[PDB]
Design a binder for this molecule. Structure first.
Ligand SMILES: [K+]
Ligand SMILES: [K+]
Length: 310
């Protein structure tokens, strides 16, 4: 039988007309105000609109499927995309697998780090759907930031971007390593997410020419509670105040695609700050569906299959 490959991600609106229902789902059924929707529409317009965004997630899932099936002849994987906040939902993907007669699946989230707040939610939804249908059995991957090829992918991109920088200003350059912020309360649960981001930054930093680095958070939601900090905008201001860096290199390694959180929260909002302090802004290409990144994911999934079967 084919092995199911459940590739999960947050979801992005396909059409402009989807923005309201998308953000209503994100906000637990609380429809965004007219002013909030207008703000969000303006942010999507700033980054060139919606059409490029969903294509990346598709290219990652199906590129991963092809990378797996061309690299070995023990099994055939079939990819099913399951999204948190728009169709096809996680539950749709699991239903599809069961209807197709898939008995065994491996799941992976398109984010390198584990949190009890975020990744566990995907896993719980997938498992509960499967339990209701009677299958498939789902063997979940929880994180994959420790993969050497993942770290090397980011180090290589940073080192290439660093060639943009005059030799004598490299000592005035800082690497800002970031991920999506989460509610600060995850720390009361001993959530490993903050430590996993620190480890990722450490592993990358020892492989790059940039001599200074800092960890930050971004893209925090608006709920009634504090979120992990510092936010990259505030951290940029603070680091300039203390050290007067001339170059900021932003690697939002918690993200895998050029979606709104990178094209707006970094390329607009962080560049506003670097502009305001007279420093230069740099941000390497995101992984998207680059063959090097597809090979990272292939390595992750095949290592999981191998551990289960070999
Ligand atoms: K678990
Ligand atoms: K914090």
């Amino acid at each position: 039988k084919k092995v199911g490959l459940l590739v999960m991600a947050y979801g992005t609106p396909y059409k402009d007309e989807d923005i309201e229902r998308y953000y209503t789902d994100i906000r637990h059924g609380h429809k965004p105000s007219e002013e909030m929707i207008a703000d969000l529409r303006g942010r999507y317009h700033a980054i060139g609109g919606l059409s490029p965004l969903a294509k990346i997630t598709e290219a990652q899932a199906y590129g991963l499927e092809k990378a797996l099936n061309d690299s070995q002849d023990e099994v055939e994987f079939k990819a099913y995309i399951g999204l948190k906040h728009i169709e096809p939902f996680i539950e749709d993907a699991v239903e599809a697998m069961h209807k197709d007669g898939i008995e065994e699946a491996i799941s992976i989230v398109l984010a390198p780090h584990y949190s009890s707040f975020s990744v566990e939610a995907y896993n719980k939804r997938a498992k509960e759907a499967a339990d209701k249908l009677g299958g498939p059995r789902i063997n979940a991957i929880n994180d994959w930031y420790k993969q050497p090829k993942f770290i090397q992918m980011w180090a290589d991109r940073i080192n290439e971007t660093a060639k943009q920088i005059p030799a004598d200003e490299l000592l005035d350059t800082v690497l800002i390593v970031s991920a999506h912020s989460l509610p600060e309360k995850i720390k009361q649960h001993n959530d490993p997410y903050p430590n996993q981001l620190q480890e990722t930054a450490d592993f990358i930093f020892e492989k790059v020419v940039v001599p200074h680095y800092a960890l930050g958070w971004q893209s925090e939601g608006k709920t009634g509670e504090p979120w992990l900090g510092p936010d990259v905008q505030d951290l940029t201001r603070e680091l300039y105040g203390r050290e007067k860096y001339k170059h900021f290199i932003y690697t939002p390694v918690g993200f895998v695609a050029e979606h709104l959180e990178v094209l707006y929260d970094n390329d607009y909002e962080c560049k506003v700050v670097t502009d305001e302090v007279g420093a230069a802004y740099h941000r390497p290409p995101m992984p998207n569906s680059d063959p090097e990144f597809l090979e990272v994911l292939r390595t992750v999934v095949w290592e999981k299959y191998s551990n289960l079967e070999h």
